[PDB]
Amino acid sequence: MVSVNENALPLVERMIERAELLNVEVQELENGTTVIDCGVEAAGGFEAGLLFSEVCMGGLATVELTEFEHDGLCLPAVQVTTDHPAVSTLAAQKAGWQVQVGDYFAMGSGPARALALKPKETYEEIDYEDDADVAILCLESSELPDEDVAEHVADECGVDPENLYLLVAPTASIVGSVQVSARVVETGLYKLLEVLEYDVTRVKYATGTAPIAPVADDDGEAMGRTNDCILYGGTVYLYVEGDDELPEVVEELPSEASEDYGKPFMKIFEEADYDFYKIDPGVFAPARVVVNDLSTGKTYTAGEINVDVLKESFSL
Amino acid sequence: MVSVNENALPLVERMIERAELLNVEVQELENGTTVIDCGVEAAGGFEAGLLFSEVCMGGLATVELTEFEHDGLCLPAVQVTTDHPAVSTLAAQKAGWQVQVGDYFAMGSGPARALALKPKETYEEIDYEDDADVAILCLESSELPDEDVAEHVADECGVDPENLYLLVAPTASIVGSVQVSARVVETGLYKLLEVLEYDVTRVKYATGTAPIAPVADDDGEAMGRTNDCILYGGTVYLYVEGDDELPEVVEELPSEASEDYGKPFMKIFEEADYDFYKIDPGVFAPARVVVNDLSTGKTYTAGEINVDVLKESFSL
Amino acid sequence: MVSVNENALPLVERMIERAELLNVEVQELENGTTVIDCGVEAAGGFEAGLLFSEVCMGGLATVELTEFEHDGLCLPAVQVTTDHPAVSTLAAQKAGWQVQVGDYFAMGSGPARALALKPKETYEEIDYEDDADVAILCLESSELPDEDVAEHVADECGVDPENLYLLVAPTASIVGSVQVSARVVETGLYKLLEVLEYDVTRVKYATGTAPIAPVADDDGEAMGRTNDCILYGGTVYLYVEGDDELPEVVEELPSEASEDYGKPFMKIFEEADYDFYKIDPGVFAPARVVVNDLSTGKTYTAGEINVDVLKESFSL
C-alpha cells in the first residue's frame, strides 16, 4: 500500500520552501488552505513544472528533463517513470475531477482525487483508495481559486482546509507545457482501462517521453499544442503481466488506431464542432507504444512519432 | 581513500525506508542479516533497479535513466558515470564472488567483495581493500538466500551478520535488466585488466550507456539478452592516463575484437556447448569505446552499436 | 529576490563534505579562506564538474549529464536549465572578473561577482545586486590561489575571508570541459545583452545542451576545444517576453551570424594574432538557438550544430 497524498506532501513542502527559487507564489486563504501559484501571476519554470508533475503523480513517479530530436525538430522533453503505473497515473494524475464552484471552473488532477474518489468508478476498477489526513490537488486554470473552491475540495476529500494544498497553472504556461507532456504515460493507461477495457493493474512498470510544447498565447491553443506532444510526439514503454489478447490490445493502443488521427488537435477539435463528446476517445493516446509482456518475454510495438503534425501544430 | 561499503550504506538505508515505494520487500533473518528482495517475490521496478546498481557500484557512481534510439530501435537505457573507475566497477560492481552454500548458488557482486576479497588477485592488482564494519552484497538469483548463506557472507567479510545487507533479484526481472546494463562500464574495465593486462588505475573518469533489455520469461534467456545490451548496445567513454600502447589497446577493447562476436549471446553460449570456459573472454566487452588520452589530448575510438543483433536477441 | 551566493552555499558545503568522493582537495588558508581544488592537483571528475557548474550558476540552475550524438560523433554532454536566466548566467556564471594579484592571473566567475559587482555595468543593466555574508568564486587557472588572492577577492566582496570559498580548476581538466560546456546558455544571454543590446530580463526560462570536450594536454588548446563545444555543438532553448524586433534578434544570435564562424576557435584565435580584441564578439554564441516568444506563442530558430568543425577540433 502506498499513499499518493502522503508521498506527494514532501514535494509540496519543498515547493513552498523554495518558492522564490521556483518562481511560485504561495498564499494562505482564510480557511487555512495553501494555494501555490505556479503560473497565473507567478512565472513558474521548468523546475516548478517538474515538481508540479511529480506532485500530480502522487510522489510515485520521477519526471525529469531530456531532449527530443527527430527529423530536424529539436525540443526539450520530459521523461516520466513510475513503478506504480495504475495508481500513479489513474488514482492521482488523471484530470478526472471537474471542479465547479460558483463562477469558477477548472479540471482537477492529482492525489486529492483518491480521497474524494473522482470519479468513483476508476477507484473501484483499480481497487485503490487513499488514507491520508492531507489532500493535494492540481488545478489547470487561468485564475487562482478562492476560499470557497478550497473549502469545497477540502470537504469532498474529508480533510480540514488547513491540510489542503492547491497547485495552480494555466495551460498556456511553461508549467502547463511540462505537466501536460508528463501525462504521456497516463493517457496510455487511461485508454487501456476506459477505451480498451484492459485490466491496468497488469501494468507493473512504465516509462515514457514527450516533447514540451512551445507556450501559446492563450489556453485554447495551448490545449491543442500540449495534447499534440502526446498524440504525435509521445513514446510509452509498458511492462505488463500479459494475456492472450495483449497483441491485439497493443495494436489498438496508439493514437493512430483512431479515425481522428492525422491533424493537430485544434483541427480535430474544430471539426468536432468544439465538442469533446464528438471526438473519438481513442485518439487521446501516445504516438508510439512499446510493450514488454513479462509472462512471455515478448515485445509488441505500434504507432510512430509524427514530426510533421508537431511542426504544423507549433507553426515550425 | 573511499570506502565502497560505507558509501553504499546510505543507499541501502534509503531502499529500506522507501521499500513500499520501490516495491522491494525487506526481512530480517534470525542471525540479524537484512535481506532486501528486489525481484524474486517483490516486483521491484526501475527505481529499485537504479539504486540496486548504485549500491552494487559502492555508492561511487550515478546510474540514471535515459533513452536508446538507433536504427528504429527505441528502448529505455541506463547512463552510468563514475570518477572512481577501477574501485567502483572492479572492487565492487564485478560479479566476482561465486556464492555456494549447500543447495544455494548465486553470483555475488557489490562492495562486500572488498572486505572478503573475492577474488584476491583483483584487489592486489588495483591496490585496494575496504575498511568498514558493514558489508553489502548483491545476489543475482531466482531464490532468496536463507540464514546460512547470510552467515557465510558475513563471516568471510569479517562483520557481524546484523551488519550485513543482501540485495537480491533474478536475471529475468526489470531490476535484472537495469543492473546488468549498468555494468557496461565495468565490462570494459574488467577486460582491460584481465584480458589486455592494462593498468586500470590509469583510468581516471568513466561514463557509459546501454539499453535495458526486455524482460525474458526465464533467467537463462535473460542472461543472453542483458549481455547483448552491453556487447551490442553499449557505449563507454574512458579518460585515461595513457601510454605508448594505448592506441593498440583501444582497438582490442570492443566486443568485436573477439572472434565470438556477431550473434546473440544465447547463440554464442549454445555454440560453446553451454560452457563459459569455451567462450572467448574478450567478447565480454562494450560494443563501442571512446577513449580520451589525458596525457596527449588525443581520442581513440573502436567498435559500433549493432542494432541488428539486438533486434534478433529481443525478437523484434 | 534570490541570492546567488546563499543559494550556491549548500552545494559548496556538499563538495567539502564529499571531497574524497569527488576527488576534490579542500584546504584552509591562513586568513581563513577555503580553497577547493577541483583539478590542479586533485583529479576532480564529472560529478565535481557538475557541482562546480551549478555553484558557478549561483545555485539557480541544474546541470546534468546527457549524451551528444550527431553525424557519427558521440560524446558526453551537459544539459543546463535555469528559471532565472539573466541572474544565473550573467550575475553569476559569466567570467567577468579578471583576477590579478601579484604574479597570479585568473578569470573569475560565479556568485561572488554579484557582491564585488564585476563588471558594474552588467548589474546596472539587469538591475541585480546580491546581499549575502558569504562569497563564492570559481577560478579557471593552472595554479592554486594563495592567501593574498583570497584576501583581495574577500575584500572586494565585502566579506570576511573566513566566509570566502574559492573553487579552482584548469581549462585542461574534466572539470574544465564540463564547466565551460555548461556556459552554453550563458553565451547566448551575454551576446543578447552585450552585442545585440537586448533586454535579457525578458528571458524568463532557458535550457540548453553542449558536448563535453576531450581534455587537451594544455590549457591553450583546451580553451579552443571547450569554446568549440558551444560555438559548434551547443543548442539553447529560450523563452522570452518578446517584442517586434525578436525575429531579427534571433537571426543574429547564433555563432554563424559572425564573419569569424567556420573554423575551430584555435584557428580563429591564431588568425586574430592571438588577440581577443581582434575577434568578433558575436562569434561567442551557441551553434543553434530555438526561441519561444511567450507573448505571441511563436517559435524562431537559427543556426545549426557543426559536427565537422567539432571533429576537426578534437582531431577525430
Swiss-Prot record, chains A, B, C:
<keyword id="KW-0554">One-carbon metabolism</keyword>
<keyword id="KW-0378">Hydrolase</keyword>
<dbReference type="GO" id="GO:0006730">
    <property type="term" value="P:one-carbon metabolic process"/>
</dbReference>
<keyword id="KW-0963">Cytoplasm</keyword>
<comment type="function">
    <text>Catalyzes the reversible interconversion of 5-formyl-H(4)MPT to methenyl-H(4)MPT(+).</text>
</comment>
<protein>
    <recommendedName>
        <fullName>Methenyltetrahydromethanopterin cyclohydrolase</fullName>
        <ecNumber>3.5.4.27</ecNumber>
    </recommendedName>
</protein>
<dbReference type="Pfam" id="PF02289">
    <property type="entry name" value="MCH"/>
</dbReference>
<comment type="similarity">
    <text>Belongs to the MCH family.</text>
</comment>
<comment type="subunit">
    <text>Homotrimer.</text>
</comment>
<keyword id="KW-0484">Methanogenesis</keyword>
<comment type="pathway">
    <text>One-carbon metabolism; methanogenesis from CO(2); 5,10-methenyl-5,6,7,8-tetrahydromethanopterin from CO(2): step 3/3.</text>
</comment>
<dbReference type="InterPro" id="IPR003209">
    <property type="entry name" value="METHMP_CycHdrlase"/>
</dbReference>
<dbReference type="GO" id="GO:0018759">
    <property type="term" value="F:methenyltetrahydromethanopterin cyclohydrolase activity"/>
</dbReference>
<dbReference type="GO" id="GO:0005737">
    <property type="term" value="C:cytoplasm"/>
</dbReference>
<dbReference type="GO" id="GO:0019386">
    <property type="term" value="P:methanogenesis, from carbon dioxide"/>
</dbReference>
